[PDB]
Design a binder for this molecule. Structure first.
Ligand SMILES: [Cl-]
Length: 260
């Protein structure tokens, strides 16, 4: 009788996490929440999102639940990759600052909580817009118009199923190890720009890619972005935790229903 509560269970990552636990002998309940936490008494809470997060950390502490707060590589300035969990964060934008404030809010209100920083995600989306990787597909698929692709920012596309497996593995290790707490990193091992991802998508579905224009210049509009906020995963790898899907396989599985 192992119980897990997955917040944001309707989202891309939430659905993968909920299903990973459920298919591996866990009684999984998903939220699309203080009453649910008392009635279910979950052993583990996987939070997919600051005042609410900090309040959820208190609720988790009160029932003795292992809380996993999902965070981002955007907490780092991406000037000196790779980034260890012991490295000092320096968020360049509001997204990174909110995630870092979220982490602090959780770790300050729950001493046994874990933070899992992950990079750009993709998976079996219901809508192309659900992922910043999958939203590109129609620009790749249709060659009638030239399409500018970022070839400046270094990313590590990670399958939500990899993040889901790591969440379950971290939760299962914690069950027999109370030292499992603090900050953790998980990421795919393939360094790719949006242009390199578009190229990999084109090749996976045997599509023409000559209409794709790589933009190698630094951004000139919008919020400041980390060039290479690569996460090092030695911490989890030493613990025997991890799963990594090759992008060319993971993106084929994910985008197959949207091929026109
Ligand atoms: Cl923006």
């Amino acid at each position: 009788n192992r119980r897990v509560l997955v917040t944001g269970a309707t989202g891309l990552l939430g659905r993968a996490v909920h299903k990973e636990f459920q298919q591996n002998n866990w009684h999984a309940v998903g939220c699309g929440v203080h009453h649910i936490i008392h009635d279910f008494q979950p052993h583990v809470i996987v939070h997919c999102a600051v005042d609410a997060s900090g309040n959820l950390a208190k609720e988790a502490a009160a029932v003795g639940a292992f809380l996993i707060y999902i965070s981002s590589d955007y907490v780092f300035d991406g000037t000196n990759p790779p980034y260890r969990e012991e490295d000092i964060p320096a968020p360049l934008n509001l997204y990174g600052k909110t995630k870092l404030d979220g982490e602090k809010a959780v770790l300050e209100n729950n001493l046994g909580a874990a933070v899992l920083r992950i990079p750009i995600l993709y998976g079996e989306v219901e809508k192309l817009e659900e992922s910043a990787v999958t939203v590109m597909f129609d620009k790749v698929q249709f060659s009638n118009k030239s399409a500018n692709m970022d070839h400046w920012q270094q990313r590590f596309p990670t399958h939500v199923k990899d993040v889901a497996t790591v969440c379950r593995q971290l939760a299962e290790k914690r069950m027999l190890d109370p030292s499992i707490k603090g900050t953790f990193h998980w990421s795919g091992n393939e360094q790719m720009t949006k242009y390199e991802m578009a190229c990999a998508i084109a090749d996976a579905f045997n599509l023409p890619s000559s209409h794709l224009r790589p933009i190698t210049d630094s951004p000139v509009l919008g919020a400041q972005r980390p060039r290479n906020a690569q996460l090092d995963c030695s911490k989890l790898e030493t613990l025997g935790i991890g799963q990594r899907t090759p992008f060319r396989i993971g993106i084929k599985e994910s985008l197959w229903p949207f091929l026109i």
